[PDB]
């Protein structure tokens, strides 16, 4: 494909019921991402306390819906970055269940 976000937002079913307005894909190993749940505890954007920030910078891609994008013909702008991720963790085992932010 010629647009990573267009391809991935579609194949991961993120354009099925609507165009998900924003989404981040993380390119690190599952183990490295799961490990973040034991790293820096920070407040979640929603005020909950179960968010964790990665000590290391991680390779990520941000996907953001374009202005002309209109469901069901979704369209995205792709932006690559290397940033610390912030994820919300829950459960036993304690694992990532939401992507909160990158910083």
């Amino acid at each position: 494909s010629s647009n990573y976000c267009n391809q991935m937002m579609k194949s991961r079913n993120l354009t099925k019921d609507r165009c998900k307005p924003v989404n981040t894909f993380v390119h690190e190993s599952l183990a490295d991402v799961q490990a973040v749940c034991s790293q820096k505890n920070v407040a979640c954007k929603n005020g909950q306390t179960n968010c964790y920030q990665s000590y290391s910078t991680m390779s990520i891609t941000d996907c953001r819906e374009t202005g002309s994008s209109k469901y069901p013909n979704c369209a995205y702008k792709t932006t690559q970055a290397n940033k610390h991720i912030i994820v919300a963790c829950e459960g036993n085992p304690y694992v990532p269940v939401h992507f909160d932010a990158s910083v």
């Binding site: 991935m8 991961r12 079913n13 993120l14 989404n23 981040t24 894909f25 993380v26 390119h27 690190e28 190993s29 599952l30 991402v33 891609t61 994820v87 829950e90 459960g91 694992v95 990532p96 269940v97 939401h98 992507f99």
Partner: peptide, 15 residues
């Protein structure tokens, strides 16, 4: 069916 952990992986993981 899909667990919260599996949904996170589908939405956010691309190794």
């Amino acid at each position: 069916k899909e667990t919260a952990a599996a949904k996170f992986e589908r939405q956010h993981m691309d190794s």
